[PDB]
Amino acid sequence: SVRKAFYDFIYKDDKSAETYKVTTADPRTPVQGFRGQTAEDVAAKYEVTKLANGVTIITESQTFPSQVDMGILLDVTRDETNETSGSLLSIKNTYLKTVLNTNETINYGVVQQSGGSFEMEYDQETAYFKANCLAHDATDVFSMVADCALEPRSTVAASVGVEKNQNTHKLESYLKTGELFNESVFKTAYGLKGLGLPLKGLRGNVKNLSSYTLQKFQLENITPNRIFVCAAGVESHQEFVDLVQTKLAQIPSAEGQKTHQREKSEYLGGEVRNLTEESNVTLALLFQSVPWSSADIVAFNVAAALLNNLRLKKNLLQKYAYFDQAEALNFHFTDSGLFGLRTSGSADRAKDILNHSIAELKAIASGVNADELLTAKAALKNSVLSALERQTDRLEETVKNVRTFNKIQHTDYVKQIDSVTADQVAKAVAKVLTSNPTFVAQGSQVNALPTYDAIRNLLK
Amino acid sequence: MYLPTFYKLFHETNAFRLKRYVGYGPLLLTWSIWTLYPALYNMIYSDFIPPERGVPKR
Amino acid sequence: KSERLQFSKARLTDFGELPQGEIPTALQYDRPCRVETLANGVRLAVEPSSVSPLAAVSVVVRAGTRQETLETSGVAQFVQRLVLRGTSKRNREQIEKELALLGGNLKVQVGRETTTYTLSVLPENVEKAVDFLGDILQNSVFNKQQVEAEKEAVYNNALSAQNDQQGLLLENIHFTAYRDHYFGQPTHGIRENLHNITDEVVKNFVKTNYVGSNFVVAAAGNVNSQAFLQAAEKAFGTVAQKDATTFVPNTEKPYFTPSYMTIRDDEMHNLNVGVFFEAPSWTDPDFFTINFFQRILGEYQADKYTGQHLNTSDRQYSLIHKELGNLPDVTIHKTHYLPYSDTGLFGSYFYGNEIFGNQMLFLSQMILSEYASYINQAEIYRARAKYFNELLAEQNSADIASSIATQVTYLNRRVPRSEVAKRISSLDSGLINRAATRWFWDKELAIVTWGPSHGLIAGSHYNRSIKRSTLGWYGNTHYYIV
Amino acid sequence: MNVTGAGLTHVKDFHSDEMRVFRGGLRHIADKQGNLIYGSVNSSVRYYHDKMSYERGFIQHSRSPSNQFINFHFMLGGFRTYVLERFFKQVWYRRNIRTFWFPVLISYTSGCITMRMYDNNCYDYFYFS
Amino acid sequence: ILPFKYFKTKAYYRNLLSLRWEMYAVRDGVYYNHFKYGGYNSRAYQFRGYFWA
Numbered sequence A: 001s002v003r004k005a006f007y008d009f010i011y012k013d014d015k016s017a018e019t020y021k022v023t024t025a026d027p028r029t030p031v032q033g034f035r036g037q038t039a040e041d042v043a044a045k046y047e048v049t050k051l052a053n054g055v056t057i058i059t060e061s062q063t064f065p066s067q068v069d070m071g072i073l074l075d076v077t078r079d080e081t082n083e084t085s086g087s088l089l090s091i092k093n094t095y096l097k098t099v100l101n102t103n104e105t106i107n108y109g110v111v112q113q114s115g116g117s118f119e120m121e122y123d124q125e126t127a128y129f130k131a132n133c134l135a136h137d138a139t140d141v142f143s144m145v146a147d148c149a150l151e152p153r154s155t156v157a158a159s160v161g162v163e164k165n166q167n168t169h170k171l172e173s174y175l176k177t178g179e180l181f182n183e184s185v186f187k188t189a190y191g192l193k194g195l196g197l198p199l200k201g202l203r204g205n206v207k208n209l210s211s212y213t214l215q216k217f218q219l220e221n222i223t224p225n226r227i228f229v230c231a232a233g234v235e236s237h238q239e240f241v242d243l244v245q246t247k248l249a250q251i252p253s254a255e256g257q258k259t260h261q262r263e264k265s266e267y268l269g270g271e272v273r274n275l276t277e278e279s280n281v282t283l284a285l286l287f288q289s290v291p292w293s294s295a296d297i298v299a300f301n302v303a304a305a306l307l308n309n310l311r312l313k314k315n316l317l318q319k320y321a322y323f324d325q326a327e328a329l330n331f332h333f334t335d336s337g338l339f340g341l342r343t344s345g346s347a348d349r350a351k352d353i354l355n356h357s358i359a360e361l362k363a364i365a366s367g368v369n370a371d372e373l374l375t376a377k378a379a380l381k382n383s384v385l386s387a388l389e390r391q392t393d394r395l396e397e398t399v400k401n402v403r404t405f406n407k408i409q410h411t412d413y414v415k416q417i418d419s420v421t422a423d424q425v426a427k428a429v430a431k432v433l434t435s436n437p438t439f440v441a442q443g444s445q446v447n448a449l450p451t452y453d454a455i456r457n458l459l460k
Numbered sequence B: 001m002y003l004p005t006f007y008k009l010f011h012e013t014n015a016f017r018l019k020r021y022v023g024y025g026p027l028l029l030t031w032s033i034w035t036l037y038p039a040l041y042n043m044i045y046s047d048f049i050p051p052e053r054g055v056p057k058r
Numbered sequence C: 001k002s003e004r005l006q007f008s009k010a011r012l013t014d015f016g017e018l019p020q021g022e023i024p025t026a027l028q029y030d031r032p033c034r035v036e037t038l039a040n041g042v043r044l045a046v047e048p049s050s051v052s053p054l055a056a057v058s059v060v061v062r063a064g065t066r067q068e069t070l071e072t073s074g075v076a077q078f079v080q081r082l083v084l085r086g087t088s089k090r091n092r093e094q095i096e097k098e099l100a101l102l103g104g105n106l107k108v109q110v111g112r113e114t115t116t117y118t119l120s121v122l123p124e125n126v127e128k129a130v131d132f133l134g135d136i137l138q139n140s141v142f143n144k145q146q147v148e149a150e151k152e153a154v155y156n157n158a159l160s161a162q163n164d165q166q167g168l169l170l171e172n173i174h175f176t177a178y179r180d181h182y183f184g185q186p187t188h189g190i191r192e193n194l195h196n197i198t199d200e201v202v203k204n205f206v207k208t209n210y211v212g213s214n215f216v217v218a219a220a221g222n223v224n225s226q227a228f229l230q231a232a233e234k235a236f237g238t239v240a241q242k243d244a245t246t247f248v249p250n251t252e253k254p255y256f257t258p259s260y261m262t263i264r265d266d267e268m269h270n271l272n273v274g275v276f277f278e279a280p281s282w283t284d285p286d287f288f289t290i291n292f293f294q295r296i297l298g299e300y301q302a303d304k305y306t307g308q309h310l311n312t313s314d315r316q317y318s319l320i321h322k323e324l325g326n327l328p329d330v331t332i333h334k335t336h337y338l339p340y341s342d343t344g345l346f347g348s349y350f351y352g353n354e355i356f357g358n359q360m361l362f363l364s365q366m367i368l369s370e371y372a373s374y375i376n377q378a379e380i381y382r383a384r385a386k387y388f389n390e391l392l393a394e395q396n397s398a399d400i401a402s403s404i405a406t407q408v409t410y411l412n413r414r415v416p417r418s419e420v421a422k423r424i425s426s427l428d429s430g431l432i433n434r435a436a437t438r439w440f441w442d443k444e445l446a447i448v449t450w451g452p453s454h455g456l457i458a459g460s461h462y463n464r465s466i467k468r469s470t471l472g473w474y475g476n477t478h479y480y481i482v
Numbered sequence D: 001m002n003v004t005g006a007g008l009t010h011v012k013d014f015h016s017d018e019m020r021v022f023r024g025g026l027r028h029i030a031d032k033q034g035n036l037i038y039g040s041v042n043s044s045v046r047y048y049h050d051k052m053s054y055e056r057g058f059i060q061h062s063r064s065p066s067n068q069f070i071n072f073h074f075m076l077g078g079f080r081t082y083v084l085e086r087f088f089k090q091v092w093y094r095r096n097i098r099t100f101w102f103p104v105l106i107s108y109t110s111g112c113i114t115m116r117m118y119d120n121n122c123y124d125y126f127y128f129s
Numbered sequence E: 001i002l003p004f005k006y007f008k009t010k011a012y013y014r015n016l017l018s019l020r021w022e023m024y025a026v027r028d029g030v031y032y033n034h035f036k037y038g039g040y041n042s043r044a045y046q047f048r049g050y051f052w053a
């Protein structure tokens, strides 16, 4: 009004203004006249439906008024061939770039002004575009999530992605991050195919990530039968179903056309020994674990919780000083799995780093004490429930549970962890140890290590 | 959500900057009035207030 | 449910955004919370959330670094570590086993003027968390041998503070801001005094400060209000009551001392620069306005935001991010608002290449000062939406319990989501400008620059440029060069 | 992190040999070392010739003007073909006159008409009967 | 105007020189390689190819 205009022209407070009173109200007492409503939490209900095409929809009902979360999960790095290795990384580096309905700048502005967040994360055999925002901004945000998650890559997007992928590769090489070491581990484990393709993609194929290759990748892999849409905090399932239908209904059914299909993954017991002249030696010893289908997966997690929390610290890090750091790796895949240890320590005692490490893993095969098992299970429960308490992570794991087991199992994770016993963990680890080892070593004196046959004999 | 065009943001920013800079117009006017005051006096009483017509008898 | 569909945009009257005084429907509802006070002065707060899978119990004790002395410097760390060493009822093995059996998440953080012990557990043993946590903080026995044993750990922890460069720069900012008060001394204690703390000093510190009036126990998550209240009355109800006769050091106001410190350490490859204004206290009228300012001048990292995703930095609704996008080597920026009982510090921490030292030095000063004269509505609404999302996003039991305990400690009240939303939504361009000129325009500064200072050594004093940098568009000469 | 990029991004960084005298010991830097900074007008003025050109498999032959006619192809045909036809019908008319004969003719006619009207009115002013 | 000039210039310079300096003993593994390999001279172009060769 005129009074506000006058009091803004001269930067002087308007004492009588109600907004001034509200903003300058003493924090010790509530603002006069305002008293928000009170409400109690409600049990969460999960509902799953399928469209005429293969797209699936999952909703977690509102438990308490909060920001709505949405997401799209694509079963589509395992589905990358040497022709199009690293496409998913380029998509990640330019996940906000769309040109069909909304622009890169405009959808970034949508993210910024909605006050929420929008992220894209991809693993082997999965990509996930998640977003969280206020309810009244949900619709628009979803229009961005779907397009960014389903629109074919544009030439400008691919051009930007090539540069960003090159920068990412340079940064990874400069930092010597454990991700590159894991890439080498998977290369030797599976053999540059299926799960063996590097997560960040081959560096020699970066220049080939043109819009044509990305579009070929999307056409081959992205199909309605492998698209899951998820919402969390939605009062009505049907409202979100309609919201999705308004966007993903156009996608034609892929039935009747030869599908790409995923080749069954084979495990290879290779070894890699790289001389890097590093003052520290990094070793990794892995074996084939069980897939998601097998019930032993939980046990394996407990085994990891038995190492990364209680054992591996005391037996290796505390007793020996040359152990820079040791950890237990546990990856699960739809058709295979990996479980083992990754250690790093002084190069001059590389052999001492290896033997002891094996013993620790072998100790698990020997048996587990009751107290250690209880501690590991308690720590695993704490971590899992800390993850589940946050709505976004809960929704992501809900999507993954639906896409893997066709039902929701995160509601009874605690019971599954409780059901685990020491005997099951010991037997599972003993069975895993019998598999052909996959051994990787990068260090200054990796040239002097026990032979692969000696490694197997020690493991035996 | 509030998604104003960058045209509008540029226009509003430049409007504020113009408002800020206009405040020095009076300052320079006062400086050039204190200075050159005889010129202002000549202008005022030659154009806006012309002298009287008649002449002294002598 | 809610009237009409929840995704409705009907209320978005102001061109796709809510009006000034309105708040989102989600923030109109507040979770029940009850606060009670005991005879000892211990304050029990409970905000149950049945659906949550965990229960968090956070004990906040107002004892902290502020209540120490040069001769007793660092005793707070010793108390922190010795609480878990043993007690009359439980040994070190006993307490370690108890902690392992239940949730192993026991986060203990000691900061100036406060110490927080937050324990996260399963809902079915929340009482075990209370009775345990009430015992450990109350009946702990401090042996001379045990205190001697942990001197090495405390000393090493006082040397490794440089690993978290942001934390060390904040410590140095506190040092330079309050040069005539113990509030400026580091929270990790004086290195050379950390080998002089004995059993008697620790016992005196925990007898003078750990009193009922200084205890606030908050519970969040799947917790039964009545059961938790009864358990906490049983456990913390026997805490010794505060005695007015005892003397608590450093009780005067830490008056702000503007200064500029240059920790010149070449070979670092990067520069940490912190620039801070004096800020209101917890009880000041402009408490929520400064939080809104913090969310206006948000965090930044070169791996995110304009650093990696945009055609140009100008094509966005954030001026600070617009400036930071054009600086390739300025990697990290974060805005910190630290309110205390008497004073506060609001400022920016930059971490980036030293070639841009004069930019990071003069950037945060300019933007805030610019808001003293003109702030666009786009920035106001961006900060408002960010604040709403932050209010709705506090869903983890530990963090919410800690926030409840801190709010009860510093305000004797739990501030509901709806009230904060109403307070910050009412802010307008004029109110923002007036608050900024009250706190940012033509004001003094506390500056610290840690790292390569070859290009910053000249002009490394509080010269004309530093004082004129807090003027929007006046004194911005040095920022735009290079 | 203590790394140059702070552990978050890769910085395209370069230490220019400019403002340095010795690359090692007492040895001097190459005189034209600065020219190795590609894509900079400051490096060389030749960068101002920034036309777009890329080609492969192209071979060009140019002969010394010492083995060529001083005035090549001059009056190669008859005078009529080289001058009257090539120059006065394909270089002057086909290019110049054929493009402006109509507009210039219209403008000239209109200007002449109006100037004649102006002169007639002037005569009427000056002379009576 | 002389006294105000004095206040502006000489007292101000004396105030700016009220600096507290501190030097410590850094004995970490880091070597002072920046000192050994560093430095830029604005007149280096006048010294390159002319002096100390």
Ligand SMILES: CCCCCCCCCCCCCCCCCC(=O)OC[C@H](COP(=O)([O-])OCC(O)COP(=O)([O-])OC[C@@H](COC(=O)CCCCCCCCCCCCCCCCC)OC(=O)CCCCCCCCCCCCCCCCC)OC(=O)CCCCCCCCCCCCCCCCC
Residues within 6 Å of the ligand: D068, D069, D070, D071, D072, D074
């Ligand atoms: C009504 C009835 C009418 C009846 C009559 C009708 C008549 C009709 C006539 C029609 C005429 C048609 C003309 C057609 C022209 C076509 C041209 C042509 O195609 O050119 C290419 C033609 C062919 O070359 P091409 O294309 O390589 O073809 C290869 C050929 O098959 C083979 O190539 P080539 O290499 O064998 O070429 C041979 C060519 C030459 O070709 C060459 O290789 C080039 C050689 C150039 C040499 C130039 C002269 C060098 C010396 C200069 C003076 C230095 C003085 C230094 C003093 C120092 C003192 C200290 O022959 C010559 O040697 C001729 C050069 C003549 C140069 C004259 C310049 C002026 C000299 C003045 C001297 C003054 C002295 C003063 C002393 C001191 C006084 C105090 O090349 C030439 O002709 C080059 C020479 C051109 C000379 C032009 C001179 C013009 C003079 C002015 C205009 C004339 C009127 C002036 C009136 C003045 C009144 C005051």
Ligand SMILES: CCCCCCCCCCCCCCCCCC(=O)OC[C@H](COP(=O)([O-])OCC(O)COP(=O)([O-])OC[C@@H](COC(=O)CCCCCCCCCCCCCCCCC)OC(=O)CCCCCCCCCCCCCCCCC)OC(=O)CCCCCCCCCCCCCCCCC
Residues within 6 Å of the ligand: D091, D092, D095, D096, D097, D099, D104, D105, D107, D108
């Ligand atoms: C009163 C005193 C005297 C005053 C004199 C005033 C002169 C005014 C001239 C106005 C035009 C100047 C244009 C300059 C260039 C800009 C235009 C341009 O480039 O256009 C692109 C156009 C197309 O080029 P393009 O597509 O880029 O292709 C590249 C060309 O092939 C590239 O071309 P190119 O390199 O192959 O050709 C070079 C060019 C070289 O020409 C030049 O521009 C050189 C001029 C040198 C002398 C300039 C200064 C002279 C000053 C004398 C007075 C000095 C007084 C002050 C003295 C000191 C103080 C007292 O030679 C020609 O092409 C000549 C072709 C024209 C020959 C005549 C053919 C038509 C004959 C039948 C009509 C006769 C008149 C009809 C009147 C209306 C009724 C029908 O270029 C041309 O073809 C234009 C050529 C240049 C103009 C030719 C003459 C046109 C005159 C029309 C005047 C009509 C006025 C209204 C009626 C007046 C009634 C009295």
Ligand SMILES: CCCCCCCCCCCCCCCCCC(=O)OC[C@H](COP(=O)([O-])OCC[N+](C)(C)C)OC(=O)CCCCCCCCCCCCCCCCC
Residues within 6 Å of the ligand: B014, B015, B017, B018, B021
């Ligand atoms: C006919 C005139 C010819 C002779 C030249 C006259 C020159 C007079 C110079 C002295 C008076 C200047 C007064 C305005 C000062 C503005 C300063 C400024 O930066 O602007 C603030 C802000 C910008 O703030 P800023 O802080 O970004 O300023 C920097 C501006 N740049 C980047 C351009 C250097 O701009 C405005 O919003 C106001 C602009 C006012 C001037 C607009 C000029 C064009 C429109 C009006 C004139 C149109 C007719 C021109 C003649 C055409 C004839 C056919």
Ligand SMILES: CCCCCCCCCCCCCCCCCC(=O)OC[C@H](COP(=O)([O-])OCC[N+](C)(C)C)OC(=O)CCCCCCCCCCCCCCCCC
Residues within 6 Å of the ligand: A009, A010, A011, B019, B020, B022, B023, B024, B025, B026, B029, C372, C373, C437, C441
């Ligand atoms: C006949 C002669 C008549 C003379 C009458 C004189 C009466 C003067 C009375 C003045 C009363 C006080 C007014 C205070 C205004 C403060 C505004 C403000 O907040 O400023 C901040 C802003 C800029 O702010 P800022 O960015 O510099 O800093 C703000 C400060 N903080 C951050 C702390 C809040 O400046 C302006 O508003 C300036 C523009 C407004 C004034 C413009 C006047 C133009 C007049 C031109 C001369 C005309 C002469 C006549 C010509 C006739 C031709 C025929």
